[PDB]
Design a protein around this nucleic acid. Structure first.
Lengths: 331, 229, 158, 157
RNA sequence: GUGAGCGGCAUCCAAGUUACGCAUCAGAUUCGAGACGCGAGUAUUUCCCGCGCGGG
């Protein structure tokens, strides 16, 4: 069941790429040695094949949000906003292992290794939540195919298509954001400022003396010190994305659950930058098998009323027993 | 090619000579080796060395500045700041002393363009027999650029930095005059000129110095922060 | 190069009653199959007699794109036999060298056919003026060929 | 290309009393979980069951590359070619290999070449050249009974 | 003139058929580009470092 969600972020998206990269003071990524080189936390990118207008195909890096991040965003939205209140209304409690399995697909790092009975498989795959995601001790195939978040760009046209060619952007969509860290004590300049510190002037002078003592070593660790000037790379604000969700033969309850999550999806940030309010997005269109079911009030209309009715009926009869059975280890 | 500059924020703006005396009194308590190393005194004596002094002093908006020329003087300043900072903290418990370290790169290069430099304070007289040569500006001017070139060569040799062999420094003019006083007990005031400007055929980097008796902090000027003309 | 091959138990990929609807018995049959599989797996793990459908093994293959030399010698043949060999070479690329039918192994293309030190291979196939006599002779032999020779050859004296 | 995958521990991200309100035992269970995790981590580090936290990588072929799939059949009937073309009409509805959770394996067919002839239209395999195959397979399916499958699967011993 | 001399183990034969590396998993949590260059001190010589002159 194809779902295509058009997402425009009103704040920069910061999905940090693993690894240590360095940037000069003028934005040169991986500058030659000798000049100042500050660490740079790059934004996640995926190399994709694209045409730049010359008719030939080449692999180009495209800044994306990883699909596993978006899948976990959907899972957390569904749980924290739809299923957790439903369980609390019945005053149902999930065990610690069941909670871990619901929030991360499994409770331990060791798989069971044995298959599940067909009755258990159908019971879990018919469940509104566990059917979508799956996992557990005896690994179960979920019905959810959550893809990555692809910006509507000239580089992703070979992937997403040309349906959204009106929202495309030709240039780069990333920017270096410089962060700092000044020492708190280094800002103290008057005796009355440090009246709260134990000993005040004596303690501050001792601490800065220790800083000077650990700073004397230049060339030939522990206690680096509260001082830094680094940078990170963010996908610039305003860029329109495409999120594609495919579901393998769902019941109406599962579709209603997904639609509820999409309704409440904008209440959770996409990825990273919590401290800096990064990852804020608004859903601009939701397409359900080629039809636009998005209204200014969210997913509504008679085209989706049966899904909402089914998910409401399923939630009104939802118990922790299914989660406990799903998370139970058979070894 | 490194000159280590250290700034101490006493809180109250400090005289150069008074700061020198105060730190010398403070250093006198601590390990004598660092003491004699800091004020360029031969171990066991108190004589000013003939060779180009590498560790010197200087003023600041809220304290005094350490200027350690060369690699050796820079290292001496680097391992001497914690002790002097601790001593300053002990001596003034009524104010918080704060230290930031600025390690600069020293270099000098020649360009066909004529670069104009300004020096705030200048000293050009040590002895009256030398003042007999200073009796008039006719002999004074040659002494002026001679002193500038000699100081530049001395510091370049001390830090081991090759210097443009085709340099031509030219003094331009004067604005004000002051007096240079070596010791509080000394009645003699040496020659002092303010607002001195001169032209040099080289782009000066880092911090350079000119004058006499480097061990106090007069006649200093930062070429890096002064930009150029 | 080494290629890894897997086999899966189809009943383990059932996830809805719709998939088991085509199976006679359905969910009961699937449950019985899975229970028997679990019991057999536990017995085999403990012992360390039917075998299941789960398999993971490998087979080793010669990488694709490598050139081979094939040498065929014939002991003083008539022109009909040379023509027959040439026809087989012309229609040989449609065949496949060795096993691996499922994975489409053994596919090849003939690049050059050398006939007594001379190249007789064209883009079309074995052709040229030097091979005309062989092709004419084999065409005549095919026209005159009958089952009598095969029947006499295959007949047993006793 | 290399994709970096991470697994979090839900309890570590659990940092509000309302978040633990759904867990049996409340804060006590989460505290026991965290302290047991700490003890296991310290024991494992000192030593020199596995927890939930993970950091891995999986390597994928980039999106947008074209592939050539060669299917050969030796002396097929019309019904078998029709079945193959029917499967190729509905082949894009299924993924190639791996990454079900992350929607990997999705593809689109650019062209289908049928013994040197291109039989791919924008709406699938269509044309007069393929009509007889589709008709034959439709008739065969209308005459398809399970007896062939049962006879095929029955062991001879 | 060795119980010597003389003497083809040779012909013919497919290792092939069948088999999903797959299911599950937040790159996340913290931190200021804003601070730092002197208008600081009198008149003509005093103990001395290199040796008339360089220089505490």
């Amino acid at each position: 069941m194809q779902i295509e969600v058009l997402i425009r972020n009103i704040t920069p998206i910061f999905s940090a790429a693993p690894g240590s990269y360095y940037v000069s003071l003028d934005g040169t990524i991986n500058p030659p040695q000798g000049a100042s080189r500050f660490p740079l936390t790059r934004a996640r990118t995926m190399t994709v094949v694209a045409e730049t207008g010359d008719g030939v195909a080449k692999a180009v890096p495209l800044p994306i949000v990883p699909g596993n991040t978006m899948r976990n965003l959907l899972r957390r939205t569904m749980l924290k906003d739809v299923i957790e209140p439903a369980l609390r209304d019945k005053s149902a409690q999930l065990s610690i292992g069941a909670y871990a399995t619901a929030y991360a697909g499994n409770s331990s790092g060791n798989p069971d290794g044995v298959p599940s009975s067909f009755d258990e498989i159908v019971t879990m795959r018919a469940h509104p939540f566990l059917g979508l995601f799956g996992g557990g001790p005896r690994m179960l195939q979920g019905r959810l195919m959550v893809d990555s978040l692809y910006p509507i760009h000239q580089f992703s046209q070979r992937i997403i298509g040309s349906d959204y060619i009106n929202d495309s952007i030709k240039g780069g969509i990333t920017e270096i954001v410089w962060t700092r860290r000044n020492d708190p004590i280094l800002q103290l300049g008057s005796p009355d400022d440090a009246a709260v510190i134990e000993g005040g002037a004596q303690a501050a002078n001792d601490w800065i003396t220790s800083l000077l003592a650990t700073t004397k070593a230049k060339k030939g660790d522990n206690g680096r010190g509260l001082k830094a000037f680094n940078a990170h790379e963010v996908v610039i604000a305003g860029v329109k994305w495409l999120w594609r969700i495919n579901v393998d033969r769902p019941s109406e309850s599962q579709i209603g659950l997904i639609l509820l999550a999409l309704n409440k999806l904008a209440n959770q940030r996409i990825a990273g930058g919590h401290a800096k309010d990064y990852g804020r997005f608004v859903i601009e269109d939701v397409i359900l098998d080629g039809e636009s079911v998005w209204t200014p009030s969210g997913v509504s209309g008679q085209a989706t009323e049966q899904f909402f009715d089914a998910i409401a009926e399923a939630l009104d009869g939802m118990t922790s027993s299914e989660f406990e059975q799903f998370a139970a280890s058979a070894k | 090619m490194f000159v280590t500059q250290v700034i101490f924020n006493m809180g109250e703006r400090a005289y150069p000579d008074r700061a020198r005396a105060m730190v010398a009194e403070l250093m006198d308590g601590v390990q004598p080796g660092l003491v004699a190393t800091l004020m360029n005194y031969i171990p066991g004596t108190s004589t000013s060395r003939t060779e180009f002094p590498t560790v010197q002093f200087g003023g600041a908006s809220d304290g005094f500045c350490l200027l350690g020329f060369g690699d050796g003087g820079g290292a001496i300043v680097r391992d001497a700041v914690p002790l002097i900072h601790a001593a300053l903290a002990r001596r003034m418990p009524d104010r918080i002393i704060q230290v930031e370290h600025k390690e600069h790169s020293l270099s000098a290069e020649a360009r066909p363009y004529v670069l104009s430099y300004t020096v705030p304070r200048m000293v050009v007289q040590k002895k009256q027999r030398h003042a007999e040569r200073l009796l008039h500006e006719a002999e004074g001017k040659a002494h002026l650029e001679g002193l500038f070139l000699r100081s530049l060569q001395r510091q370049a040799a001390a830090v081991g930095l090759p210097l443009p062999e085709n340099l031509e420094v030219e003094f331009k003019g004067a604005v004000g005059n002051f007096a240079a006083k070596h010791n509080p007990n000394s009645k003699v005031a040496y020659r002092g000129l303010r607002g001195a400007v001169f032209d040099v055929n080289a782009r000066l980097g880092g911090i350079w110095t000119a004058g006499f008796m480097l061990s106090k902090g007069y006649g200093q000027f930062n070429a890096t922060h002064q930009l150029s003309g | 190069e080494i290629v890894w091959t897997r086999r899966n138990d189809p009943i383990l990929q059932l996830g809805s009653p719709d998939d088991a609807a085509v199976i006679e018995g359905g969910a009961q049959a699937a449950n019985d199959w899975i229970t028997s599989l679990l019991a057999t797996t536990k017995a085999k793990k403990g012992k360390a007699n039917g075998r299941g459908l789960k398999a993971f093994n490998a087979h080793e293959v010669v990488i694709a794109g490598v050139k081979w030399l094939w040498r065929i010698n014939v002991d003083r043949p008539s022109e009909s036999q040379i023509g027959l060999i040439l026809l087989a070479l012309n229609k040989l690329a449609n065949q496949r060298i060795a096993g691996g039918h499922a994975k489409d192994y053994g596919r090849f293309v003939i690049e050059d056919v050398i006939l007594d030190g001379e190249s007789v291979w064209t883009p079309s196939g074995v052709s040229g003026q030097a091979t005309e006599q062989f092709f004419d002779a084999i065409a005549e032999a095919l026209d005159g060929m009958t089952s009598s020779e095969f029947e006499q050859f295959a007949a047993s004296a006793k």
